[PDB]
Amino acid sequence: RHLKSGRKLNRHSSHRLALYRNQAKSLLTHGRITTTVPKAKELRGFVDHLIHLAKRGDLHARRLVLRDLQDVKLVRKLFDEIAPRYRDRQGGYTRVLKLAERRRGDGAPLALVELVE
Amino acid sequence: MIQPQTYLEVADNTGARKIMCIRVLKGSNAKYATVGDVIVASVKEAIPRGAVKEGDVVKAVVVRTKKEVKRPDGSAIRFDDNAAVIINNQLEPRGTRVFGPVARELREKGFMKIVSLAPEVL
Amino acid sequence: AKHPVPKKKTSKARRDARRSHHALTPPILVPCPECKAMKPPHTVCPECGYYA
Amino acid sequence: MKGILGVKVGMTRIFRDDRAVPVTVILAGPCPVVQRRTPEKDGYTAVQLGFLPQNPKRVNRPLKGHFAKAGVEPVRILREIRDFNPEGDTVTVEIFKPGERVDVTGTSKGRGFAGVMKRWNFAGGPDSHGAHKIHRHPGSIGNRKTPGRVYKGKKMAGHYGAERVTVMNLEVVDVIPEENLLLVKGAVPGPNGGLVIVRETKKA
Amino acid sequence: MNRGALIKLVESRYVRTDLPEFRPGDTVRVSYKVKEGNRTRIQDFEGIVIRIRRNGFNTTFTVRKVSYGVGVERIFPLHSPLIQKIDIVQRGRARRAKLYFIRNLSDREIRRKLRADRKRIDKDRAAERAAKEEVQK
RNA sequence: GGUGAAAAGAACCCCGGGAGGGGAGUGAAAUAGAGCCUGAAACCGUGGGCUUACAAGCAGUCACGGCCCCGCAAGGGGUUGU
RNA sequence: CAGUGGAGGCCCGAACCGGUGGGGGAUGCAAACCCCUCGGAUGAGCUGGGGCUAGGAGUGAAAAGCUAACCGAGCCCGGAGA
RNA sequence: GUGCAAGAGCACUCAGGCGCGCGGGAGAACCCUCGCCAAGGAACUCUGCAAGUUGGCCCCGUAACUUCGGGAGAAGGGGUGC
RNA sequence: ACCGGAGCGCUGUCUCGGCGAGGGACCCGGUGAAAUUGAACUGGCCGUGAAGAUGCGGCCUACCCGUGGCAGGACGAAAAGA
RNA sequence: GGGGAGGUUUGGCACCUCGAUGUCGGCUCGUCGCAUCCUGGGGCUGAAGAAGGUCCCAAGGGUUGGGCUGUUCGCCCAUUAAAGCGGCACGCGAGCUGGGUUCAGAACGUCGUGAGACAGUUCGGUCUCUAUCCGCCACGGGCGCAGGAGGCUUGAGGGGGGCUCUUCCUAGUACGAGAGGACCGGAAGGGACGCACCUCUGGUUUCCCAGCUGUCCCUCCAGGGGCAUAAGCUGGGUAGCCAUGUGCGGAAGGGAUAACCGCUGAAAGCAUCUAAGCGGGAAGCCCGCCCCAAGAUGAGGCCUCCCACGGCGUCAAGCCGGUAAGGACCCGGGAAGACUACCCGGUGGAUGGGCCGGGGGUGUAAGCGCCGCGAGGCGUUGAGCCGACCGGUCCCAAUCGUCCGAGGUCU
Ligand SMILES: [Mg+2]
Ligand SMILES: [Mg+2]
Ligand SMILES: [Mg+2]
Ligand SMILES: [Mg+2]
Ligand SMILES: [Mg+2]
Ligand SMILES: [Mg+2]
Ligand SMILES: [Mg+2]
Ligand SMILES: [Mg+2]
Ligand SMILES: [Mg+2]
Ligand SMILES: [Mg+2]
Ligand SMILES: [Mg+2]
Ligand SMILES: [Mg+2]
Ligand SMILES: [Mg+2]
Ligand SMILES: [Mg+2]
Ligand SMILES: [Mg+2]
Ligand SMILES: [Mg+2]
Ligand SMILES: [Mg+2]
Ligand SMILES: [Mg+2]
Ligand SMILES: [Mg+2]
Ligand SMILES: [Mg+2]
Ligand SMILES: [Mg+2]
Ligand SMILES: [Mg+2]
Ligand SMILES: [Mg+2]
Ligand SMILES: [Mg+2]
Ligand SMILES: [Mg+2]
Ligand SMILES: [Mg+2]
Ligand SMILES: [Mg+2]
Ligand SMILES: [Mg+2]
Ligand SMILES: [Mg+2]
Ligand SMILES: [Mg+2]
Ligand SMILES: [Mg+2]
Ligand SMILES: [Mg+2]
Ligand SMILES: [Mg+2]
Ligand SMILES: [Mg+2]
Ligand SMILES: [Mg+2]
Ligand SMILES: [Mg+2]
Ligand SMILES: [Mg+2]
Ligand SMILES: [Mg+2]
Ligand SMILES: [Mg+2]
Ligand SMILES: [Mg+2]
Ligand SMILES: [Mg+2]
Ligand SMILES: [Mg+2]
Ligand SMILES: [Mg+2]
Ligand SMILES: [Mg+2]
Ligand SMILES: [Mg+2]
Ligand SMILES: [Mg+2]
Ligand SMILES: [Mg+2]
Ligand SMILES: [Mg+2]
Ligand SMILES: [Mg+2]
Ligand SMILES: [Mg+2]
Ligand SMILES: [Mg+2]
Ligand SMILES: [Mg+2]
Ligand SMILES: [Mg+2]
Ligand SMILES: [Mg+2]
Ligand SMILES: [Mg+2]
Ligand SMILES: [Mg+2]
Ligand SMILES: [Mg+2]
Ligand SMILES: [Mg+2]
Ligand SMILES: [Mg+2]
Ligand SMILES: [Mg+2]
Ligand SMILES: [Mg+2]
Ligand SMILES: [Mg+2]
Ligand SMILES: [Mg+2]
Ligand SMILES: [Mg+2]
Ligand SMILES: [Mg+2]
Ligand SMILES: [Mg+2]
Ligand SMILES: [Mg+2]
Ligand SMILES: [Mg+2]
Ligand SMILES: [Mg+2]
Ligand SMILES: [Mg+2]
Ligand SMILES: [Mg+2]
Ligand SMILES: [Mg+2]
Ligand SMILES: [Mg+2]
Ligand SMILES: [Mg+2]
Ligand SMILES: [Mg+2]
Ligand SMILES: [Mg+2]
Ligand SMILES: [Mg+2]
Ligand SMILES: [Mg+2]
Ligand SMILES: [Mg+2]
Ligand SMILES: [Mg+2]
Ligand SMILES: [Mg+2]
Ligand SMILES: [Mg+2]
Ligand SMILES: [Mg+2]
Ligand SMILES: [Mg+2]
Ligand SMILES: [Mg+2]
Ligand SMILES: [Mg+2]
Ligand SMILES: [Mg+2]
Ligand SMILES: [Mg+2]
Ligand SMILES: [Mg+2]
Ligand SMILES: [Mg+2]
Ligand SMILES: [Mg+2]
Ligand SMILES: [Mg+2]
Ligand SMILES: [Mg+2]
Ligand SMILES: [Mg+2]
Ligand SMILES: [Mg+2]
Ligand SMILES: [Mg+2]
Ligand SMILES: [Mg+2]
Ligand SMILES: [Mg+2]
Ligand SMILES: [Mg+2]
Ligand SMILES: [Mg+2]
Ligand SMILES: [Mg+2]
Ligand SMILES: [Mg+2]
Ligand SMILES: [Mg+2]
Ligand SMILES: [Mg+2]
Ligand SMILES: [Mg+2]
Ligand SMILES: [Mg+2]
Ligand SMILES: [Mg+2]
Ligand SMILES: [Mg+2]
Ligand SMILES: [Mg+2]
Ligand SMILES: [Mg+2]
Ligand SMILES: [Mg+2]
Ligand SMILES: [Mg+2]
């Protein structure tokens, strides 16, 4: 209802955003991250924009991406190592595949987020 | 949309300064009255020795409203206050020389008098 | 403990009946390309990994 | 008894002589008649127009043996338009001259489990003075020992909208035979991209 | 069909292209086709544009002036067969898209708030009086 | 409150992290295996027989009929369609 | 008159004391709570510790209020199987 | 600690300490706590209940009445940043 | 923070509702209550009956089982009517 | 003076209910009756016309907003077509309310020596999260429908809707001394209500964009983050959802009738609408329009697609298997949605996510340069950022696969 819109959320906004943010910091720091499918299917398109944003170079975009990740060094790494690999590729900088094991005694389904390669 | 407890600015010189609506004289229960609609009102304040006294129950006609009027031509008009001109029971304006704009709607409703005196029909 | 309450002990019958839609259905498994292993489709499943 | 299938494409307004007109645009692609229903074989008379162009692949059905049985490039949908038998092999906007009045059928947007307030424009409680847990409630639903039951049809909340809605008698404005468009008086059910069917009214 | 919107846009030939760009927060005189008794004058209307409301076709705008000590706003369809021609008549430093805020200031403070867009003025009197000569020879 | 005559209180192997079990073993008996004699009823379950998705109900009773079961048959038992 | 002075069951307002209005809670977080609001806040003030007063009795700025979560006469055991 | 006229107030924050011992999804009605709303502006209603408006400091200014202290923060205004 | 009447300001109190946020409700995994309960195979109407019927009569209707919802009945629960 | 109907008043009786059937008024939601307030149809009129009066027929729909009182009721204001009356436990407190009344506090009048008392007043005064069955709203699972399957449908039976005013032409004509002022037929514009809808207008739009305060941080400046809600505040806002906004609806028409008006016509030479027979005649009845609908077990119809036996039962019903058409799973999703269901897509693919373009919002980013002691200003610049919409593009993900599904009984 009125869902006639688009894009999900559990947690509240101050929190929801912080979530995405941290989930990226991790993904960029760890290249691979396990997390619940929804949590993931969402975080997916968040990094893409930050990857594609690093595919550019101007400090505007550095500073821009600096907004969501707060760690200079990790953005350094974002622009210096991570972005290159993704030239000539347009979108899809990221993958998620669902794992077959559920979390225990909360029975959450899981899945995999991956810096695509 | 003018309605029952609403105050209207008085647009003529009948010596009334404000009437509040009292009843709108569309059908047997119209929810609101707009430009070119005649309502019953009560004079809530009235210039010293006018024709009309505070407390006089009167007929008047909505010449300007604060809620925009749509025109079939697809445009709209809105004024910074609500205003009416007190008119006769037979429907002629009780004052003379009304002032401040007015809606063309007034014309098509049979109120030429007022629009004639109107210093600018918008 | 209050306002609305059950008017009669529901019966073994009536009870078990409501229960009729309770039974679960078994998982959906499929063999993988890799092992003879069994997977929920569209998953990955350990001891088998994956390509690409 | 004209009729053609279409899709609510969208709406805007356009200017006639010298006033704005709220119009909704139906695209009513050339509907291939696909069967006809006689008073003899069927017992009633009408005509089965198809609509969207279909992949001969997904038509793997026994559906092929219908389109085939009338040599019609497979469509996506096809509804009958009762009591109206045309000619040629397809019906097109051309059945409609501007100024003809039509009834468009559509499928109302779906509001899901609806409040009695939204479903019936019910009053509901007072935002203020009294209680606070009946704000949007229907309130009383009955009497006492007699009847001692609720009437069928009682307005109550629940799944509302997303249903067959016919809005009678809109005016056809300029029909664009070119791009297959059909212009109307706006008030036509369902969302954009929905199947709809237009017909001659009942004015006289 | 995947056109969807392109088809709405086709529905538009009613597009007019003669009227000039005008930013909100600067005065315009719009000459409007008016039905008087049963004739057609062209009532003018000259105020600050308060709100352009983009939607391509059926984008619209409003202008607000004080007719006889009373304020007035008029809403205009930007492509109305009823606008004769819209005479621009002053360019202003808006600093903000929708600017109804001016409603409760209405006076001189408006003036101190809506300076003249010197930039865009320079643009016009330039490439206008400057394209006058390119027409001649 | 109550294993058993006696602790003979179940070595040892097997599945399990354990619990608990399956074998092996003791005992006259282990559904006497350790809050363990006997072990009723409510109550929960597994298997089987008859039965039930156009039907109206203090749930039974009377009749006929079908099915299943015990008996060679005459008979009886279970079920329940009308 | 000005200065100085720094009174007050004085004013505004936290702590602290309290419970005005509304909402919430009503098998509650809670056998009296929560939120917003509100009253006092140098006084007839609030408060720790040590003491004394009790059942037709005490205590009571007085409501028959309080006297160990129900007080127009406490709780317990007894007369009592009134 | 910093800021706000002041402060044990308020916002953020050291030190220190916590995320309140069920989670995961979805994004219906309805309930709770909260935000905003065209025109109107008490017509609501037992009652403006509730919400809202107002709000600190600085200057201007301030009525009946009075027990001469009051009424007074009357009212109504203007200023406030860099 | 007494109770009544009036006005100004302001407002979702109302005309007359709409959208949005979150905590529940809903769905999946863990844990898992309660009052109540003659037994139940528990429909509508008009009768009737201890004078207000799912349970008598007559007629009408009605495939089996649930889930989210609403409160008209079960003279619903509660308390051996104040 | 007389006879009745009703069961809305005041009562009488004391029959169920004192191991409890919560009371007045309001709100919310109504639904029935007709003894009709309006609108429709008519008879008489002391009916010229217009307006009325009285009676008949007719529930289809409608039946306003305020002032005062807890009030119902009533008076009053302003309207209206009209502001109908009753039933439903004086309908409705496991729906709200709690102003009224009948707990404890307090006071006045009053009675009583008194304690206290008073259908006398007056101020205060705890209204209980969880629905088992029936009923109701909505939504599924099962099986059924004598072959299986895909699609399209008939409409038995239900349901929704049903109001009404004003001005104009007819015509200032009929009627009337005048004042007044029609039938009939036609047009236009409204009120309220209903269903859809977002183009417009107007809302919201919780992070789409901007600005601003305090503070704490990154990194000193710049620049930026957290927090000040569960958005810190403010200005503004797409899609979606919406009304204040937009469209449409009430019919027309056919049929049968009510009161009533008649044609012909006896009985009863005439007379009569009637007893045989026939015509007209209502906003009402049946149709018609809209929606549901074959569990219509009385399970309908059409078009189409798939099709014998491979082994036991001696005729007979079956039983077990791999299959057919076809279907299901699982997945990507959806103006579809509580769940389920529904619908689309699943690499032969644009379904979602990105990326791109557009639409749209904000309103000139940063950095650098330039002017100014400075706060700032100006240029680069309609820049920068940029959800949802209209598209595009296989970059990512819908991988791969599994299961089920007839072999069609008898005259
Ligand atoms: Mg989407
Ligand atoms: Mg003039
Ligand atoms: Mg003039
Ligand atoms: Mg002049
Ligand atoms: Mg059982
Ligand atoms: Mg398909
Ligand atoms: Mg309301
Ligand atoms: Mg309450
Ligand atoms: Mg409650
Ligand atoms: Mg009944
Ligand atoms: Mg726009
Ligand atoms: Mg031992
Ligand atoms: Mg062992
Ligand atoms: Mg050994
Ligand atoms: Mg361990
Ligand atoms: Mg052990
Ligand atoms: Mg033995
Ligand atoms: Mg034994
Ligand atoms: Mg043991
Ligand atoms: Mg034991
Ligand atoms: Mg036993
Ligand atoms: Mg057997
Ligand atoms: Mg049967
Ligand atoms: Mg047997
Ligand atoms: Mg002092
Ligand atoms: Mg003091
Ligand atoms: Mg004080
Ligand atoms: Mg203290
Ligand atoms: Mg106290
Ligand atoms: Mg109190
Ligand atoms: Mg409660
Ligand atoms: Mg002391
Ligand atoms: Mg005592
Ligand atoms: Mg005791
Ligand atoms: Mg004795
Ligand atoms: Mg906890
Ligand atoms: Mg605002
Ligand atoms: Mg408002
Ligand atoms: Mg406003
Ligand atoms: Mg406003
Ligand atoms: Mg009102
Ligand atoms: Mg009152
Ligand atoms: Mg208040
Ligand atoms: Mg304020
Ligand atoms: Mg005062
Ligand atoms: Mg400062
Ligand atoms: Mg008793
Ligand atoms: Mg009475
Ligand atoms: Mg007796
Ligand atoms: Mg009882
Ligand atoms: Mg009871
Ligand atoms: Mg009761
Ligand atoms: Mg009572
Ligand atoms: Mg008459
Ligand atoms: Mg007459
Ligand atoms: Mg007459
Ligand atoms: Mg009659
Ligand atoms: Mg009658
Ligand atoms: Mg009726
Ligand atoms: Mg009625
Ligand atoms: Mg009705
Ligand atoms: Mg009142
Ligand atoms: Mg009275
Ligand atoms: Mg009634
Ligand atoms: Mg009652
Ligand atoms: Mg009740
Ligand atoms: Mg009540
Ligand atoms: Mg009371
Ligand atoms: Mg109260
Ligand atoms: Mg009172
Ligand atoms: Mg009292
Ligand atoms: Mg009392
Ligand atoms: Mg008495
Ligand atoms: Mg009182
Ligand atoms: Mg009080
Ligand atoms: Mg109550
Ligand atoms: Mg209360
Ligand atoms: Mg609750
Ligand atoms: Mg009806
Ligand atoms: Mg009709
Ligand atoms: Mg004339
Ligand atoms: Mg005359
Ligand atoms: Mg809009
Ligand atoms: Mg706005
Ligand atoms: Mg929007
Ligand atoms: Mg932002
Ligand atoms: Mg800095
Ligand atoms: Mg800089
Ligand atoms: Mg931080
Ligand atoms: Mg922090
Ligand atoms: Mg904002
Ligand atoms: Mg509306
Ligand atoms: Mg004769
Ligand atoms: Mg005759
Ligand atoms: Mg039947
Ligand atoms: Mg074959
Ligand atoms: Mg063969
Ligand atoms: Mg195959
Ligand atoms: Mg196949
Ligand atoms: Mg499928
Ligand atoms: Mg395929
Ligand atoms: Mg391809
Ligand atoms: Mg795409
Ligand atoms: Mg610039
Ligand atoms: Mg600049
Ligand atoms: Mg810049
Ligand atoms: Mg440089
Ligand atoms: Mg831009
Ligand atoms: Mg860009
Ligand atoms: Mg490509
Ligand atoms: Mg392609
Ligand atoms: Mg099989």
Q: What is the dihedral of CA B17, B23, B24, B28, to 10 degrees?
A: -170
For residues A14 and A88, is the Cβ–Cβ distance under 8 A?
no
Single-letter code of the amino acid located at D121: N
Q: What is the resolution of this structure in A?
A: 3.4
The DSSP bridge pattern shows strands B38-46 and B16-24 to be antiparallel
Burial of B44 (0-12, 13-18, 19+ CB in 10 A): middle
CA E123 vs CA D187, E91, E119: distances in Å = 46, 10, 6
For residues D182 and D26, is the Cβ–Cβ distance under 8 A?
yes
Dig out the tokens for E98 from the structure: 């929708």
> Own/partner pairs for B88-94, CB < 8 Å, 24+ apart?
B88/B59, B89/B59, B91/B38, B91/B59, B93/B12, B93/B117, B94/B12, B94/B14, B94/B51, B94/B52, B94/B58
Q: Where are the alpha helices (DSSP H) in D104-196?
A: 116-120
Q: Which nucleotide is nearest to D156 (CA to C1')?
A: J137
Q: How far is CA A100 from the centre of its chain?
A: 21
Question: What's the CA gap between E75 and B66, in Å, rounded?
Answer: 14
Question: What's the CA gap between D132 and D128, in Å, rounded?
Answer: 7
Tell me the CA end-to-end span of chain A in Å, nearest whole number. 38
| D16 at interface of B, judged by CB pairs closer than 8 A | no
For residues B87 and B10, is the Cβ–Cβ distance under 8 A?
no
Strand runs labelled E in chain E: 27-35, 40-43, 46-53, 60-67, 70-77, 83-88
For residues D143 and D182, is the Cβ–Cβ distance under 8 A?
no
Chain E residues whose CB is inside 8 A of the D7 CB are 1
For residues A96 and A40, is the Cβ–Cβ distance under 8 A?
yes
> Own/partner pairs for B53-60, CB < 8 Å, 24+ apart?
B56/B16, B57/B22, B58/B16, B58/B19, B58/B86, B58/B94, B59/B25, B59/B86, B59/B87, B59/B88, B59/B89, B59/B91, B60/B8, B60/B10, B60/B19, B60/B84, B60/B85, B60/B86, B60/B87
Q: Which residue of A has its CA nearest to D162?
A: A1
Q: Which residue of E has its CA nearest to D11?
A: E8
- The structure's method of determination equals X-ray
Single-letter code of the amino acid located at D56: P
Q: Which residue has the tokens 């639903």?
A: D141
Task: Give A36→chain C minimum CA distance, Å.
Answer: 13
Can you give the distance from the CA of residue D117 to the C1' of nucleotide J227 in angstroms?
A: 39
For residues E50 and E24, is the Cβ–Cβ distance under 8 A?
yes
Q: Give residue A99 CA to ligand 54 midpoint distance, Å.
A: 87
CA E42 vs CA A37, E34, E65: distances in Å = 64, 6, 18
Flag if B76 and E74 touch (Cβ within 8 Å): yes
Question: What's the CA gap between D117 and D38, in Å, rounded?
Answer: 47
**Chain E 69-108, CB < 7 Å to strand J:** 75, 93-98, 100-101
Chains E and A touch each other (3 or more Cβ pairs < 8 A):
no
**Chain C 16-35, CB < 7 Å to strand F:** 16
| A112 at interface of C, judged by CB pairs closer than 8 A | yes
Q: Give residue A73 CA to ligand 84 midpoint distance, Å.
A: 43
| B72 at interface of D, judged by CB pairs closer than 8 A | yes
